[PDB]
Write a protein that binds this ligand. Structure first.
Ligand SMILES: O=C(c1cncc(Br)c1)N1CCC(N2CCCC2)CC1
Length: 313
């Protein structure tokens, strides 16, 4: 099975490499993560939280991570160039809380101690694209407030705060709702807006959970009472729409089984999202995804990085 003859017979084209970010497309980077290495990372299900993680498996430019002390059924996959993982010691250097391994208390964890107990090796620093050393996203400070789309309920735009800053990105948290709604982004995110936006657009604005009298929510007053500034207007950047077109072919990570990367088609487009369809599978497995998502790649990525590719069914 090859991309070449498959394209021939389908009279199809692949999405050009140029339609992707460099980090989605890059194949010549070696993967230096080795089995048993320990590091720190965000929980995908709790994007504001950081845990002790061990490399459980390495495949191509990808690695499977395991939550030390917890069940293997929580394991997840990231790419070797993910910004959501950090070297041992990072949490305490950059102001982040670390949840310790199951059984430990947060006033009982020490890397040096834990490395002795487990006889384990920390993932070397140089492997991580993200260590909080590069320029911060201009204008966005921890504490500042803005309006953001609830990506879980995307029809809503809500009162939100910047609660974390890590290298070129920041974390958007929805005032007084659970952290499970938080998501990471950057100045160009299509889902974020200055304080005031909902009002200039005619749109209704979703106030923090439990805010007395939602319809008469007042930004100016809420800011004063919470001792907070609004992200300044100039900080927000227009991201241009992606250039993907319906029926372009590519490679995408399987959601229901994330170990696998399948042949894929662009089923439907939006300005910033694409709908993925896995060739020869039922359309019921189709799903939408942002165009900058680390888990879509150009044709040949699997080949060039040495990760198996699932041919169409
Ligand atoms: O489940 C919902 C919901 C309920 N009914 C209609 C919609 Br549309 C959404 N909500 C309201 C929105 C809440 N978001 C707002 C900001 C983050 C949480 C989550 C719970």
């Amino acid at each position: 099975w090859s991309w070449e003859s498959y394209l021939e017979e389908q009279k199809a084209i692949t999405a050009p490499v140029s339609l992707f970010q460099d980090s989605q497309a890059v194949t010549h980077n070696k993967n230096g993560f080795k089995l048993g290495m320990k590091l720190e990372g965000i929980d995908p299900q709790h994007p504001s939280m950081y845990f002790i993680l061990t490399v459980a498996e390495v495949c191509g430019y990808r690695l499977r991570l395991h939550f030390d002390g917890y069940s293997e059924c929580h394991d997840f996959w990231v790419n070797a160039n993910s910004p959501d993982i950090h070297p041992a010691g990072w949490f305490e250097k950059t102001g982040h809380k670390l949840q310790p391994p199951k059984g430990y208390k947060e006033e009982e964890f020490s890397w040096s101690q834990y490395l002795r107990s487990t006889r384990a090796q920390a993932a070397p620093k140089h492997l991580f694209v993200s260590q909080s050393h590069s320029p911060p996203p201009l204008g966005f400070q921890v504490g500042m407030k803005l309006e953001a789309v609830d990506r879980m309920n995307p029809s809503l735009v809500c009162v939100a705060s910047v609660t974390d800053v890590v290298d070129s990105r920041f974390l958007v948290h929805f005032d007084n709702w659970d952290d499970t709604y938080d998501y990471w982004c950057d100045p160009s995110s299509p889902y974020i807006h200055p304080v005031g936006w909902c009002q200039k657009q005619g749109k209704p604005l979703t106030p923090p959970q439990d805010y007395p009298d939602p319809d008469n929510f007042c930004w100016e007053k809420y800011l004063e009472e919470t001792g907070a500034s609004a992200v300044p207007t100039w900080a927000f950047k227009v991201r241009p729409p992606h250039s993907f077109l319906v029926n372009m072919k590519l490679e995408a990570v399987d959601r229901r089984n994330p170990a696998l990367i399948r042949v894929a088609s662009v089923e439907d487009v939006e300005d910033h999202r694409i709908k993925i369809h896995f060739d020869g599978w039922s359309h019921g497995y189709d799903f939408w995804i942002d165009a900058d998502h680390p888990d879509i790649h150009p044709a040949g990525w699997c080949s060039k990085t040495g990760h198996p590719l699932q041919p169409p069914l």
